[PDB]
Amino acid sequence: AAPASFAALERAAGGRLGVCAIDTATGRRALHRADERFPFCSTFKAMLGAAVLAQSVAHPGLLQQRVTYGRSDLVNYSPVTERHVDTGMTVAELCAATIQYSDNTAANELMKRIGGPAAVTAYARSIGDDTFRLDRWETELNTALPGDLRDTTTPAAMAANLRVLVLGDALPPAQRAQLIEWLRGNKVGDKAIRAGVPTGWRVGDKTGTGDYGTTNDVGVLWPPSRAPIVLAVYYTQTRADAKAKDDVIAAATRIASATLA
């Protein structure tokens, strides 16, 4: 009954689905529109966290630096930063808030510190990603307009980034461990990739949502007795009034897992 392929799922759900899944042992892939651009929405916060950690290699005091912001700096959906207007937060605390809870002000404050959307894009280029482009700030970067190139990447490009960042040597070991810790601690993605993997699998991931019913999730999956799988899922719909489909990512995850079994 449930669609059994990425193409069948895309037909059943409507809209446009993009998947890149990599079995890091065999190199086998599960792919659908893997080289098409999608609005990445909050999945970029994985790259933002990596960019902050990379700057912390030359400036090891960066994570400790205290950032003070005001009421008028708050943007929509700031569940952690709205509690610390008076005290400020450290750069590390902002990274944790933006990756684990997808806190939006936290992302904007981190970007102010490190050089804005251009700095995240430059970091992407530095790890071999010529595709990723971050152009705007929260929450405008989630407008997800059909055809718009702003704030997009491809499933394949993001999957390649996750592979080198989590399982490769793009970051030194301490920063690599920190990025993995933050991704494993996603608290707001229970219905996405995490709902579509078999029990016993461990997940580190970053979700995203936006306008045009956009729902994304990217991460690394550790099965109990097998090499990890890198998985990037992007999904967006045709109408501005579209509602998020909170089950499409989990369905795509089941299909990717079956293909790579």
For the chain, domains (ranges, CATH) are 6-259 (3.40.710.10)
Residue 107 near residue 95 (C-beta atoms within 8 A): no
d(CA 104, CA 106): 5
What residues contact 57, with CB distance under 8 A and at least 6 apart?
Answer: 171, 172, 175
Helix axes 44-58, 155-162, angle to 10 degrees: 40
Return d(Cα 52, Cα 67) in angstroms, integer. 14
Helix (H) or strand (E) holding 230: strand 229-236
* Nearest partner of 128 among 165, 103, 99, judged by Cα: 165
CA distances from 3 to 8, 62, 199 (A): 5, 47, 21
The type of residue at 146 is: P
212, 236 contact by CB (below 8 A): yes
39 three-state secondary structure: strand
Cα distances (angstroms) measured from residue 140 to each of 53, 55, 155, 169: 25, 25, 21, 33
Experimental approach was X-ray
Q: What is the number of other CB atoms lying within 10 angstroms of the CB of residue 200?
A: 9
* End-to-end CA gap in the chain: 20
The pairing of strands 16-23 and 38-39 is unpaired
What sign does the CA torsion over 33, 36, 40, 43 have? positive
Helix axes 44-58, 91-100, angle to 10 degrees: 160
For 117, the 3-state DSSP assignment is helix
Q: Which of 162, 149, 151 is nearest to 111 (CA)?
A: 151
In eight-state DSSP terms, residue 229 is E
Query: How far is Cα of residue 201 from the mean position of the Cα atoms in its chain?
Result: 19
Enter the resolution in angstroms: 1.5
For residues 47, 53, 179 and 36, what is the CA-based torsion angle, rounded to 10 degrees?
10
Give the residue numbers marked as catalytic: 42
Residues 6+ apart with CB under 8 A from 115: 122
Give the CA diameter of the chain.
Answer: 54
Q: How far apart are CA 138 and CA 88, in angstroms?
A: 19
Please, what is the Cα angle at 96 between 207 and 44, to 5 degrees?
A: 40
CB 172 within 8 A of CB 104: no
Cβ contact 25:73 at 8 Å? no
At residue 127, what is the residue type? I
Q: Locate 13 and state its tokens.
A: 């759900």
Give the 3-state secondary structure percentages of the chain, helix then strand then coil, rounded to 5. 45, 20, 40
| φ, ψ of residue 106 in degrees (nearest 5) | -55, -45
- Cα dihedral value 75, 81, 83, 84, nearest 10: -120
Q: What are phi and psi of 221, to 5 degrees?
A: -120, 130
Read off the tokens for 117. Answer: 């959307």
